[PDB]
Design a protein around this ligand. Structure first.
Ligand code: NEA
Length: 393
DNA sequence: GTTCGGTGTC
DNA sequence: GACACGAAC
């Protein structure tokens, strides 16, 4: 799947290898990265491409092509430079996930990768594999989704990279015309330590990196675009997660099998609410977006907290904070559900106002840009709340 | 329990 | 661009 030439050129500009060095393109198909590196830096390297699909492998005679699953491949010797664009996707059942392998193959991947966590992703596994294949002081330059900067599934991967060498992350954003993904380039070197975060600007002449921040003692913490303002706001109030237990809605299959739940409206039945029912500062209790209906009073059988009016915050409205007080205490199939901790005093209307405020939207957009199409728990629990809105006694 | 999206669908 | 679900663990 194609990489824009300006992305390739940018990545090649970050790449290096010594004379006679071993240069690898994993998932290479026709080897556009090998070709670009050779054109830019010359011929005195050992070029290798690894590709699983015989129909796809189409390298020039000056490169060695290997037909293999890169994730399970064991070469005789490590590499000086590894570059390219790995495949992206979750391994799982075809009805829901795009990568389809025998369970036994998924088992080999889990055995192979110390960073594998949750559903994980091929791109995480490619990154780990590549790092393991680098000689000491070797370099990797990959373009991958930005999701690993922030997501829990990638916590082990971030800790692994922090531990194994030094990391530079260059934000590109949505640079693939046909693909819905916000991208970064990672340049990793198997020596030293620390993280450098870079923005980019694109011009006619390609991408130009702009240094944003440096974290010389990075240990795999979530990566964010921090500013003087984000810092200033964070120290102005209690993290939201110190004021509230944060829970998630019961999931669709739990409602679908529950004997109280119906697929048609009826006397005494209310809609099972989704994200579409959640608006800034109010809840649309009437419209049904889930296809599911149930008695309001039986909602507590799915989660005890559905019995109690409480704060609800959106998960799938992009990088935004959208909140409302569920005054009626309805069943929800989506969103975060925040229950105040013992001793917490709240002004719900004011807090909802603050969460929905322009200041709050700019805060989260600065920090997290468009890495993921969600406000995640790790973002939400860090939102700052001053004494006007909430107070822990 | 709750996570994630070479997103899904308008 | 608007505006957002179940297999996975
Ligand atoms: N480098 C372009 C994006 S990734 C798409 C390419 O990766 C190949 N590919 C996918 N999974 C692979 C794997 N595990 N090992 C080697 N090649 C793989 C595909 O056949 C395809 O040519």
């Amino acid at each position: 799947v194609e990489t824009p030439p300006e992305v390739v050129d940018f990545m090649v500009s970050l790449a290096e290898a010594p004379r006679g060095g071993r240069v690898l393109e994993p998932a290479c198909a026709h080897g556009p990265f090998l070709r670009a590196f050779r054109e830019a830096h010359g011929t005195a390297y050992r070029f290798v491409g690894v590709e699983i699909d015989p129909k796809a492998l189409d390298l020039p005679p000056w490169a060695e092509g290997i037909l293999a699953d890169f994730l399970l491949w064991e070469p005789g010797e490590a590499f000086d430079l590894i570059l390219g664009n790995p495949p992206y996707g979750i391994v799982g059942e075809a009805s829901k996930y795009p990568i389809h392998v025998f369970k036994a193959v998924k088992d080999l991947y889990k055995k192979a990768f110390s960073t594998w966590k949750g559903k994980y992703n091929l791109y995480g596994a490619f990154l780990e594999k590549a790092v393991r294949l680098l000689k000491p002081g070797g370099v990797l330059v990959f373009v991958v989704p930005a999701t690993w900067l922030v997501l829990e599934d990638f916590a082990l991967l971030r800790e692994f990279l922090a531990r194994e060498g030094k990391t530079s992350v260059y934000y590109l954003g949505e640079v693939f015309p046909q693909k819905k993904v916000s991208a970064v380039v990672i340049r990793f070197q198997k020596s030293g330590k620390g993280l450098s975060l870079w923005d980019t600007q694109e011009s006619e002449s390609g991408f130009t990196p702009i240094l944003w921040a440096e974290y010389p003692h990075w240990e795999g913490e979530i990566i964010r675009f921090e500013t003087e303002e984000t810092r200033k706001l964070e120290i102005s109030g209690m993290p939201l997660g110190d004021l509230f237990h944060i829970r998630f809605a019961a999931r669709s299959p739990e409602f679908k099998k529950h004997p109280a739940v119906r697929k048609e409206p009826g006397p005494g039945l209310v809609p099972v609410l989704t994200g579409r029912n959640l608006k800034p500062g109010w809840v649309d209790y009437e419209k049904n977006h889930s296809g599911l209906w149930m008695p309001k009073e039986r909602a507590k059988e799915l989660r005890d907290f559905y019995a109690t009016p409480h704060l609800v915050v959106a998960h799938t409205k992009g990088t935004r904070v959208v909140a409302a007080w569920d005054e009626r205490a309805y069943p929800w199939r989506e969103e975060f559900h925040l229950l105040p901790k013992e001793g917490v005093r709240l002004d719900p209307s004011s807090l909802v106002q603050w969460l929905n405020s322009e200041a709050m939207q700019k805060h989260v957009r600065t920090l997290y840009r468009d890495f993921v199409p969600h406000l995640t728990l790790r973002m939400l629990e860090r939102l700052p709340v001053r004494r006007e809105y909430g107070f822990h006694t």
